Design an enzyme around this catalytic site. Structure first.
Site, PDB file in Angstrom:
ATOM      1  CG  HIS A   1      -0.151  -0.211   2.467  1.00 10.51           C
ATOM      2  ND1 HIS A   1       0.135  -1.308   3.039  1.00 10.51           N
ATOM      3  CD2 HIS A   1       0.353   0.746   3.458  1.00 10.51           C
ATOM      4  CE1 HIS A   1       0.686  -1.380   4.173  1.00 10.51           C
ATOM      5  NE2 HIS A   1       0.912   0.014   4.363  1.00 10.51           N
TER       6      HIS A   1
ATOM      7  CE1 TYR B   1      -7.460   6.014   3.238  1.00  8.37           C
ATOM      8  CE2 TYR B   1      -5.452   7.296   3.168  1.00  8.37           C
ATOM      9  CZ  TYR B   1      -6.686   7.079   3.709  1.00  8.37           C
ATOM     10  OH  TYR B   1      -6.994   7.961   4.859  1.00  8.37           O
ATOM     11  CB  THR B   2      -5.164  -0.678  -1.125  1.00  2.00           C
ATOM     12  OG1 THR B   2      -4.260  -1.407  -0.130  1.00  2.00           O
ATOM     13  CG2 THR B   2      -4.577  -1.611  -2.395  1.00  2.00           C
TER      14      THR B   2
ATOM     15  CB  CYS C   1      -8.208  -5.819   4.969  1.00  2.00           C
ATOM     16  SG  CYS C   1      -7.735  -4.014   5.322  1.00  2.00           S
TER      17      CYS C   1
HETATM   18  C1  LIG Z   1      -3.547  -1.827   3.965  1.00  2.00           C
HETATM   19  C2  LIG Z   1      -4.906  -0.742   4.413  1.00  2.00           C
HETATM   20  C3  LIG Z   1      -5.416  -0.242   3.134  1.00  2.00           C
HETATM   21  C4  LIG Z   1      -6.469   0.750   3.114  1.00  2.00           C
HETATM   22  N1  LIG Z   1      -7.101   1.079   2.004  1.00  2.00           N
HETATM   23  C5  LIG Z   1      -8.119   1.972   2.182  1.00  2.00           C
HETATM   24  C6  LIG Z   1      -8.891   2.683   0.913  1.00  2.00           C
HETATM   25  O1  LIG Z   1      -8.461   2.116  -0.150  1.00  2.00           O
HETATM   26  N2  LIG Z   1      -9.927   3.454   1.244  1.00  2.00           N
HETATM   27  C7  LIG Z   1     -10.194   3.731   2.587  1.00  2.00           C
HETATM   28  O2  LIG Z   1     -11.121   4.594   2.518  1.00  2.00           O
HETATM   29  N3  LIG Z   1      -9.646   3.458   3.517  1.00  2.00           N
HETATM   30  C8  LIG Z   1      -8.511   2.680   3.355  1.00  2.00           C
HETATM   31  N4  LIG Z   1      -7.890   2.324   4.641  1.00  2.00           N
HETATM   32  C9  LIG Z   1      -8.129   2.993   5.778  1.00  2.00           C
HETATM   33  C10 LIG Z   1      -7.516   4.090   6.139  1.00  2.00           C
HETATM   34  O3  LIG Z   1      -5.903   3.785   6.226  1.00  2.00           O
HETATM   35  C11 LIG Z   1      -8.045   5.116   7.473  1.00  2.00           C
HETATM   36  O4  LIG Z   1      -8.025   4.315   8.421  1.00  2.00           O
HETATM   37  C12 LIG Z   1      -9.338   5.652   6.979  1.00  2.00           C
HETATM   38  O5  LIG Z   1      -9.173   6.488   6.011  1.00  2.00           O
HETATM   39  C13 LIG Z   1      -9.787   6.647   8.039  1.00  2.00           C
HETATM   40  O6  LIG Z   1      -8.884   7.574   8.607  1.00  2.00           O
HETATM   41  P1  LIG Z   1      -9.403   8.800   9.107  1.00  2.00           P
HETATM   42  O7  LIG Z   1      -7.949   9.662   9.230  1.00  2.00           O
HETATM   43  O8  LIG Z   1     -10.157   9.837   8.033  1.00  2.00           O
HETATM   44  O9  LIG Z   1     -10.096   8.796  10.456  1.00  2.00           O
HETATM   45  P2  LIG Z   1      -9.769   8.646  11.522  1.00  2.00           P
HETATM   46  O10 LIG Z   1      -9.200  10.024  12.248  1.00  2.00           O
HETATM   47  O11 LIG Z   1      -8.314   7.881  11.896  1.00  2.00           O
HETATM   48  O12 LIG Z   1     -10.703   7.975  12.674  1.00  2.00           O
HETATM   49  C14 LIG Z   1     -11.572   7.211  12.062  1.00  2.00           C
HETATM   50  C15 LIG Z   1     -11.938   5.881  12.890  1.00  2.00           C
HETATM   51  O13 LIG Z   1     -12.687   6.395  13.790  1.00  2.00           O
HETATM   52  C16 LIG Z   1     -13.972   5.647  13.291  1.00  2.00           C
HETATM   53  N5  LIG Z   1     -14.971   6.851  12.999  1.00  2.00           N
HETATM   54  C17 LIG Z   1     -14.598   8.309  12.885  1.00  2.00           C
HETATM   55  N6  LIG Z   1     -15.565   8.852  12.341  1.00  2.00           N
HETATM   56  C18 LIG Z   1     -16.637   8.122  12.141  1.00  2.00           C
HETATM   57  C19 LIG Z   1     -17.847   7.971  11.354  1.00  2.00           C
HETATM   58  N7  LIG Z   1     -18.459   9.144  10.920  1.00  2.00           N
HETATM   59  N8  LIG Z   1     -18.750   6.827  11.150  1.00  2.00           N
HETATM   60  C20 LIG Z   1     -18.057   5.646  11.577  1.00  2.00           C
HETATM   61  N9  LIG Z   1     -16.848   5.337  12.157  1.00  2.00           N
HETATM   62  C21 LIG Z   1     -16.097   6.820  12.394  1.00  2.00           C
HETATM   63  C22 LIG Z   1     -13.721   4.708  12.415  1.00  2.00           C
HETATM   64  O14 LIG Z   1     -13.437   3.516  13.380  1.00  2.00           O
HETATM   65  C23 LIG Z   1     -12.576   5.150  11.822  1.00  2.00           C
HETATM   66  O15 LIG Z   1     -11.885   4.111  11.364  1.00  2.00           O
HETATM   67  C24 LIG Z   1      -6.943   0.987   4.442  1.00  2.00           C
HETATM   68  C25 LIG Z   1      -6.299   0.739   5.520  1.00  2.00           C
HETATM   69  C26 LIG Z   1      -5.158  -0.248   5.552  1.00  2.00           C
HETATM   70  C27 LIG Z   1      -4.304  -0.893   6.651  1.00  2.00           C
END
Ligand SMILES: Cc1cc2nc3c(=O)[nH]c(=O)nc-3n(C[C@H](O)[C@H](O)[C@H](O)COP(=O)(O)OP(=O)(O)OC[C@H]3O[C@@H](n4cnc5c(N)ncnc54)[C@H](O)[C@@H]3O)c2cc1C
Ligand SMILES: NC(=O)c1ccc[n+]([C@@H]2O[C@H](COP(=O)([O-])OP(=O)(O)OC[C@H]3O[C@@H](n4cnc5c(N)ncnc54)[C@H](O)[C@@H]3O)[C@@H](O)[C@H]2O)c1
Length: 271
Positions: free
Chosen positions: A48, A64-65, A244
């Site tokens: 990723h 992200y992937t 995942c």
């Molecule tokens: C290998 C890998 C590949 C990934 N590929 C993708 C991808 O292709 N596309 C993608 O969108 N993400 C992907 N993810 C997830 C990504 O890395 C993030 O975790 C995601 O985008 C959320 O980050 P954030 O900064 O926006 O939210 P954060 O600030 O980190 O907080 C979000 C977390 O709090 C919770 N949360 C916060 N607000 C809400 C809400 N309104 N409703 C429900 N839950 C909530 C959720 O659990 C959420 O995971 C991937 C993760 C991994 C490990």
């Protein structure tokens, strides 16, 4: 061969947002330009990238992937679920990076880095998996691969599925169990079903949803023992099982049920 974007994982590459598309209620596709129309990203299957930015005064880095591949020249596509503020009572602030992306204007940039990850698919059933960041890859070749994805967890699976189906001499059979909250939340359904229609011998596709519609022919509920028994290859085939999804999905729904069915930890990998 094409110029590569990600030449060094320690380096940051600012890429420009050039297009954006609504996928569903909370998810969007973001397209970024690569350094030239003839560049490729340079992302081995199974790995990723990370996006990084200073968001409201804090460093935020997330993996992200891409849904694009190294066959795509000049751009990279991310399908990203936006966690909106003022929506979930448990998370009133919403998500940092996803909302930042959602706020971006066409022409804005964000830094990419990569490639990263302990697993690399080397083709024809062959996986190179490092036990951790300080150890040599273990090379595991299998006839079939079980995949359990929840929500955006589909993207690491889709990258591998596509890499396999592209190669007519790759006889690896992928069995995907894809879990989502509701039917409308089944991300990339048309792409998945197109793959199933074209590659049914090598791609087995099953869905479960937390809440099911009236007309539903698949499964309903969190991932359970029956779903794993019926929709992943049996332990006797010694398949790799990739996962995942949300942490509790892996911890409470996947792992204990994989164990009940008889898939050893050694065969399992969580992205
Ligand atoms: C290998 C890998 C590949 C990934 N590929 C993708 C991808 O292709 N596309 C993608 O969108 N993400 C992907 N993810 C997830 C990504 O890395 C993030 O975790 C995601 O985008 C959320 O980050 P954030 O900064 O926006 O939210 P954060 O600030 O980190 O907080 C979000 C977390 O709090 C919770 N949360 C916060 N607000 C809400 C809400 N309104 N409703 C429900 N839950 C909530 C959720 O659990 C959420 O995971 C991937 C993760 C991994 C490990
Ligand atoms: C992390 O999580 C990301 C996906 O998150 P998302 O917002 O798209 O997922 P999500 O909130 O939409 O949930 C997806 C699926 O995960 C499972 N799940 C969620 N919470 C669970 C729990 N407490 N116990 C058992 N199963 C549960 C459910 O099957 C659910 O349908 C991935 O990118 C991964 O890297």
């Amino acid at each position: 061969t094409p110029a590569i974007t990600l030449e060094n994982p320690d380096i940051k590459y600012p890429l420009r947002l050039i297009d954006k598309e609504v996928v569903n209620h909370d998810t969007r596709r973001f397209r970024f330009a690569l350094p030239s129309p003839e560049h490729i990203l340079g992302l081995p299957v199974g790995q990723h990238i990370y996006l990084s930015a200073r968001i409201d005064g804090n460093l935020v880095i997330r993996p992200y992937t891409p849904v694009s591949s190294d066959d795509d020249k000049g751009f990279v596509d991310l399908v990203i679920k936006v966690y909106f503020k003022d929506t979930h009572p448990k998370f009133p602030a919403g998500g940092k990076m996803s909302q930042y992306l959602e706020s971006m204007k066409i022409g804005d940039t964000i830094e990419f880095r990569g490639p990263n990850g302990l697993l690399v698919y080397q083709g024809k059933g062959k996986f190179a998996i490092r036990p951790d960041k300080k150890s040599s890859p273990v090379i595991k070749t299998v006839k079939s691969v079980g995949m359990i994805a929840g929500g955006t967890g589909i993207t690491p699976m889709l990258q591998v599925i596509r890499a396999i189906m592209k190669d007519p001499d790759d006889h690896t059979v992928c069995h995907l169990l894809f879990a989502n909250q509701t039917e409308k939340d089944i991300l990339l359904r048309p792409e998945l079903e197109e793959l199933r229609n074209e590659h049914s011998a090598r791609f087995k596709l099953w869905y479960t949803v937390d809440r099911a519609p009236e007309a539903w022919d698949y499964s309903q509920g969190f991932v359970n023992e029956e779903m794993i028994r019926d929709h992943l290859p049996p332990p006797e085939e010694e398949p790799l099982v990739l996962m995942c999804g949300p942490p509790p999905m892996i911890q409470y729904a996947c792992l204990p049920n994989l164990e009940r069915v008889g898939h050893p930890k050694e065969r399992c990998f969580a992205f």
